[PDB]
Design an enzyme around this catalytic site. Structure first.
Site, PDB file in Angstrom:
ATOM      1  N   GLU A 134     -58.050  17.600  -9.799  1.00 23.96           N
ATOM      2  CA  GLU A 134     -59.144  17.006 -10.599  1.00 23.96           C
ATOM      3  C   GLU A 134     -59.132  15.464 -10.521  1.00 23.96           C
ATOM      4  O   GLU A 134     -60.193  14.842 -10.537  1.00 23.96           O
ATOM      5  CB  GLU A 134     -59.121  17.504 -12.065  1.00 23.96           C
ATOM      6  CG  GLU A 134     -58.074  16.829 -12.893  1.00 23.96           C
ATOM      7  CD  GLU A 134     -58.102  17.215 -14.356  1.00 23.96           C
ATOM      8  OE1 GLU A 134     -59.205  17.411 -14.927  1.00 23.96           O
ATOM      9  OE2 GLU A 134     -57.006  17.273 -14.951  1.00 23.96           O
ATOM     10  N   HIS A 178     -53.551  24.571 -18.948  1.00 25.03           N
ATOM     11  CA  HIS A 178     -53.664  23.144 -18.620  1.00 25.03           C
ATOM     12  C   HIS A 178     -53.254  22.301 -19.815  1.00 25.03           C
ATOM     13  O   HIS A 178     -53.416  22.748 -20.940  1.00 25.03           O
ATOM     14  CB  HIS A 178     -55.093  22.816 -18.215  1.00 25.03           C
ATOM     15  CG  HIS A 178     -55.385  23.107 -16.772  1.00 25.03           C
ATOM     16  ND1 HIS A 178     -55.058  24.312 -16.176  1.00 25.03           N
ATOM     17  CD2 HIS A 178     -55.918  22.337 -15.795  1.00 25.03           C
ATOM     18  CE1 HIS A 178     -55.409  24.284 -14.896  1.00 25.03           C
ATOM     19  NE2 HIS A 178     -55.957  23.104 -14.650  1.00 25.03           N
ATOM     20  N   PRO A 223     -54.891   4.881 -17.640  1.00 28.58           N
ATOM     21  CA  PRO A 223     -55.582   5.380 -18.856  1.00 28.58           C
ATOM     22  C   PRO A 223     -55.719   6.894 -18.967  1.00 28.58           C
ATOM     23  O   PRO A 223     -56.001   7.557 -17.995  1.00 28.58           O
ATOM     24  CB  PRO A 223     -56.994   4.758 -18.771  1.00 28.58           C
ATOM     25  CG  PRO A 223     -56.790   3.488 -17.882  1.00 28.58           C
ATOM     26  CD  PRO A 223     -55.682   3.880 -16.890  1.00 28.58           C
ATOM     27  N   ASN A 224     -55.567   7.435 -20.167  1.00 25.68           N
ATOM     28  CA  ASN A 224     -55.770   8.866 -20.359  1.00 25.68           C
ATOM     29  C   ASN A 224     -56.211   9.081 -21.794  1.00 25.68           C
ATOM     30  O   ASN A 224     -55.785   8.371 -22.662  1.00 25.68           O
ATOM     31  CB  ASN A 224     -54.463   9.630 -20.061  1.00 25.68           C
ATOM     32  CG  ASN A 224     -54.632  11.148 -20.136  1.00 25.68           C
ATOM     33  OD1 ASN A 224     -54.828  11.700 -21.220  1.00 25.68           O
ATOM     34  ND2 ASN A 224     -54.516  11.830 -18.995  1.00 25.68           N
ATOM     35  N   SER A 225     -57.052  10.057 -22.057  1.00 26.99           N
ATOM     36  CA  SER A 225     -57.584  10.157 -23.409  1.00 26.99           C
ATOM     37  C   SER A 225     -56.520  10.552 -24.453  1.00 26.99           C
ATOM     38  O   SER A 225     -56.713  10.340 -25.640  1.00 26.99           O
ATOM     39  CB  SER A 225     -58.738  11.127 -23.456  1.00 26.99           C
ATOM     40  OG  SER A 225     -58.285  12.418 -23.087  1.00 26.99           O
ATOM     41  N   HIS A 253     -60.535  29.229 -21.866  1.00 29.37           N
ATOM     42  CA  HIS A 253     -60.339  28.799 -23.264  1.00 29.37           C
ATOM     43  C   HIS A 253     -59.986  27.319 -23.407  1.00 29.37           C
ATOM     44  O   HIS A 253     -58.864  26.987 -23.785  1.00 29.37           O
ATOM     45  CB  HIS A 253     -59.254  29.649 -23.950  1.00 29.37           C
ATOM     46  CG  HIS A 253     -59.690  31.051 -24.230  1.00 29.37           C
ATOM     47  ND1 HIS A 253     -58.823  32.045 -24.636  1.00 29.37           N
ATOM     48  CD2 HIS A 253     -60.915  31.623 -24.148  1.00 29.37           C
ATOM     49  CE1 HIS A 253     -59.500  33.169 -24.797  1.00 29.37           C
ATOM     50  NE2 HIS A 253     -60.767  32.949 -24.487  1.00 29.37           N
ATOM     51  N   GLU A 284     -50.353  13.440 -16.584  1.00 30.88           N
ATOM     52  CA  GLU A 284     -51.348  13.312 -15.531  1.00 30.88           C
ATOM     53  C   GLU A 284     -51.306  11.954 -14.784  1.00 30.88           C
ATOM     54  O   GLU A 284     -52.340  11.335 -14.529  1.00 30.88           O
ATOM     55  CB  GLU A 284     -52.741  13.545 -16.137  1.00 30.88           C
ATOM     56  CG  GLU A 284     -52.902  14.998 -16.572  1.00 30.88           C
ATOM     57  CD  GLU A 284     -54.256  15.293 -17.108  1.00 30.88           C
ATOM     58  OE1 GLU A 284     -55.039  14.346 -17.478  1.00 30.88           O
ATOM     59  OE2 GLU A 284     -54.553  16.476 -17.123  1.00 30.88           O
TER      60      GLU A 284
HETATM   61  O1  LIG Z   1     -61.927  22.090 -15.969  1.00 32.22           O
HETATM   62  C1  LIG Z   1     -60.837  21.661 -16.770  1.00 32.22           C
HETATM   63  C2  LIG Z   1     -59.690  21.026 -15.966  1.00 32.22           C
HETATM   64  O2  LIG Z   1     -59.181  21.937 -15.005  1.00 32.22           O
HETATM   65  C3  LIG Z   1     -58.575  20.732 -16.956  1.00 32.22           C
HETATM   66  O3  LIG Z   1     -57.399  20.096 -16.388  1.00 32.22           O
HETATM   67  C4  LIG Z   1     -59.090  19.719 -17.995  1.00 32.22           C
HETATM   68  N1  LIG Z   1     -60.411  20.022 -18.520  1.00 32.22           N
HETATM   69  C5  LIG Z   1     -60.906  19.582 -19.818  1.00 32.22           C
HETATM   70  C6  LIG Z   1     -62.322  20.147 -19.816  1.00 32.22           C
HETATM   71  C7  LIG Z   1     -62.322  21.259 -18.805  1.00 32.22           C
HETATM   72  O4  LIG Z   1     -61.721  22.401 -19.410  1.00 32.22           O
HETATM   73  C8  LIG Z   1     -61.448  20.663 -17.722  1.00 32.22           C
HETATM   74 CA   LIG Z   2     -56.242  18.142 -16.913  1.00 35.94          CA
END
Ligand SMILES: O[C@H]1[C@H](O)[C@@H](O)CN2CC[C@H](O)[C@H]12
Ligand SMILES: [Ca+2]
Length: 687
Positions: free
Chosen positions: A493, A468, A176-178, A399, A155
């Site tokens: 996002e 994702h 930074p990223n978790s 999910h 990301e």
């Molecule tokens: O809406 C999603 C997003 O599209 C994902 O890339 C990451 N997410 C983590 C929490 C939630 O699911 C959010």
């Molecule tokens: Ca994401």
């Protein structure tokens, strides 16, 4: 010394073993070196000399062959793809270890693929890879378009720089990223895109990443040699193998015309043919909206309540908790999205935050985080299903696993059955957090197996998947066409978390899209996030017209319109392009392309003679002198042009556009200007 050449004679691959018994290869394109002499091999983990699978080889046999067949994807950028290459297979025998491997090369007109193959034999059965050492020696200090090598996230915003500058820029490139594990001051991800001073474009990637660990690249900047660098497991090893087995393919896609990097189907060509026999009966493209941007921007919550410091599924009684007033995934709100979706011809509505457990979704390394089946008190599963079916809409399942993978696997059959029982046939999965089992990475052999397991199980249920945070795609969609999407890169996002670089969508088609579509979630019209949530001062780095272009310039059979309905209602005339644009294509023509600067694409909608054009541009904007002779002579078309106002600008004037409606034919011409961070979109419908 072995010579392989492309069908059209423009590419030559030369193979030999050197004086040390190291397999070495090189590649030329129209008499220009693309790959300087580079070695191939692996080092295996000790169970001494059996760890060496990198030299002391000798050629025991070679076989050649040619292939030329066409095939049709279930969905894609055109109806039909041609698979056309000359092949060389080289059996290498290692006398010290009495064992053989095979390196197979397939050379196409637009580049080379190679893989290693390990036949079943007396002295090679189970083995573990310490590291793979596939080299790619560059001929100069190319300009590269790269993100940081990382076992856990993709990301990142891209950086444009010389190969000699990577080392110096890596620290600032890693933001930074978790969940992130960078591995090298000179490590980058694939697909990696480069532009050389002598007029070539070069993309390094892999294809068919299956039963194997994800490949990244490590640059030796003394050398300008890139090398494969795989993702380690929890104990540091890089793949458990059992003969007979294959590495994935490694690809070098090359051309003197950037547009042809986009036109290449080498990735999909190197994948196994479709293994889902009835796929065309049930896999369909999906245009959708969703209860999503609320939580992404911070205006709304995925959680149902704010009163608990943590939750325990099966113990927490949510019907006794106090609603936080902020929960977007509630029946009445979902029904309004269902209303808007049906009014404007969308296929589906995604809802996030519908299920018990979101209070704890983030950062807790929680095992039993969701059950994927139990709805919150304000989410009426059956009523929503009844309403959606009434409007001809389908609900899209969500999910999020919060990266607790054993837990997802334990629940997966019951989650899919739940979907079947309640009229969901496509799911968006996620994996945010450090992987549980703990110590594994997102892109190791372990997880690669898990993502494909999820897709194969979904197929048995006739469910489509969009995942994702999974490993980035490598063409597996040919083999399993129900994998209709991943994120697996920096998406819309992040336009809400500080923004993406202006040139971001001029690079992704060249890198990330190679191997598979992206669920980029374009279509934000209100680009100042503070209007959704006053505490968020993030601004989307785009004009409105460029958001429209992305339905054409960011290829995907799964396309979201990501803004909330209110905001689309404020610009319904612009919205018309999103309503009209198709999702699947009989033809694609790459009109202009330059990575980092601009991309313009015309696509012919499947089973129509309607065409849709999109242009996306970076910081300097771009001027288009468009010619329309992909249009059918003698026909007439109604064309609607959605363009940036001449005063448009992503930052200072993003909402300024014009809409013009006129007649086009294959004799028409159009001059258009994409603003700074701007672009344009055009529908061209036969009369
Ligand atoms: O809406 C999603 C997003 O599209 C994902 O890339 C990451 N997410 C983590 C929490 C939630 O699911 C959010
Ligand atoms: Ca994401």
């Amino acid at each position: 010394q072995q010579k392989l050449t492309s069908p059209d004679n423009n590419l030559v691959m030369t193979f030999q073993v050197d004086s040390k018994g190291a397999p070495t290869y090189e590649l030329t394109y129209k008499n220009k070196v693309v790959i300087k002499p580079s070695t191939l091999g692996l080092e295996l983990k000790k169970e001494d000399s059996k760890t060496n699978l990198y030299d002391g080889f000798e050629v025991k046999d070679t076989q050649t062959a040619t292939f030329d067949e066409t095939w049709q994807p279930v969905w894609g950028e055109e109806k039909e793809i041609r698979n056309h290459y000359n092949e060389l297979a080289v059996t290498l025998y290692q006398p010290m270890n009495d064992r053989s491997i095979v390196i197979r090369f397939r050379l196409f007109n637009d580049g080379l693929g190679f893989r290693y193959e390990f036949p079943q034999q007396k002295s090679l059965n189970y083995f573990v890879i310490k590291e793979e050492h596939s080299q790619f020696g560059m001929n100069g200090d190319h300009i590269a378009f790269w993100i940081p090598g990382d076992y856990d996230t993709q990301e990142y915003d891209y950086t444009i720089s010389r190969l000699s500058e990577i080392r110096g820029l890596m620290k600032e490139a890693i933001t930074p990223n978790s969940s992130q594990t960078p591995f090298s001051q000179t490590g980058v991800q694939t697909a990696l895109m480069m532009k050389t001073d002598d007029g070539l474009y070069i993309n390094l990637h892999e294809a068919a990443l299956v039963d194997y660990s994800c490949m990244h690249l490590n640059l030796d900047d003394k050398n300008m040699v890139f090398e494969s660098w795989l993702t380690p497991d929890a104990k540091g090893d890089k793949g458990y193998m059992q003969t007979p087995c294959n590495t994935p393919w490694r690809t070098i896609i090359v051309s003197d015309d950037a547009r042809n990097i986009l036109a290449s189907r080498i990735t999909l060509n190197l994948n196994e043919p479709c293994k889902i026999a009835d796929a065309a009966s049930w896999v369909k493209p999906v245009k959708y909206i969703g209860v999503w941007w609320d939580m992404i921007t911070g205006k709304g919550s995925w959680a149902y309540t704010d009163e608990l410091t943590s939750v325990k599924l099966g113990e927490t009684d949510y019907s006794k908790t106090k609603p936080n007033g902020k929960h977007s995934a509630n029946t009445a709100n979902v029904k309004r999205y269902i209303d808007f979706a049906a009014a404007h011809g969308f296929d589906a509505v995604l809802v996030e935050g519908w299920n018990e457990g979101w209070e704890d979704w983030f950062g807790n390394s929680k095992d039993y985080v969701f059950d994927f089946v139990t709805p919150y008190p304000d989410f009426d599963v059956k009523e929503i299903h009844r309403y959606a079916a009434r409007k001809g809409i389908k609900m899209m399942m969500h999910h999020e696993t919060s990266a607790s993978v054993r837990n997802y696997e334990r629940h997966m059959d019951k989650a899919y059955q739940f979907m079947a029982d309640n009229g969901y046939n496509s799911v968006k999965s996620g994996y945010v957090g450090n992987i549980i089992p703990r110590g594994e990475h997102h892109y190791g052999q372990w997880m690669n197996n898990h993502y494909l397991y999820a897709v194969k199980k979904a197929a048995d249920y006739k469910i489509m998947v969009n995942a994702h945070e999974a490993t980035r795609p490598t063409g597996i969609c040919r083999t399993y066409p129900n994998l209709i999407g991943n994120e697996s890169a920096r998406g819309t996002e992040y336009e809400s978390f500080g923004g993406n670089k202006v040139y971001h969508t001029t690079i992704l088609p060249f890198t990330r899209l190679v191997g598979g579509p992206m669920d980029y979630t374009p279509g934000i019209f209100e680009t100042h996030c503070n209007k959704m949530n006053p505490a968020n001062n993030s601004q989307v780095r785009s004009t409105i017209a460029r958001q429209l272009a992305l339905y054409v310039t960011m290829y995907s059979p799964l396309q979201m319109a990501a803004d909330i309905p209110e905001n689309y209602e404020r610009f319904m005339d612009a919205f018309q392009f999103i309503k009209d644009v198709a999702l699947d294509w009989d033809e694609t023509n790459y009109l202009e392309a330059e990575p980092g600067e601009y991309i313009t694409i015309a696509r012919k909608a499947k089973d129509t003679d309607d065409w849709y054009v999109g242009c996306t541009a970076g910081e300097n904007g771009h001027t288009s002198k468009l010619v329309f002779d992909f249009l059918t002579p003698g026909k007439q078309y109604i064309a609607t042009v959605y363009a940036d106002a001449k005063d448009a600008d992503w930052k200072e004037n993003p909402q300024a556009y014009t809409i013009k409606k006129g007649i086009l034919t294959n004799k028409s011409k159009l001059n258009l200007h994409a603003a700074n961070g701007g672009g344009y979109a055009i529908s061209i419908k036969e009369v």
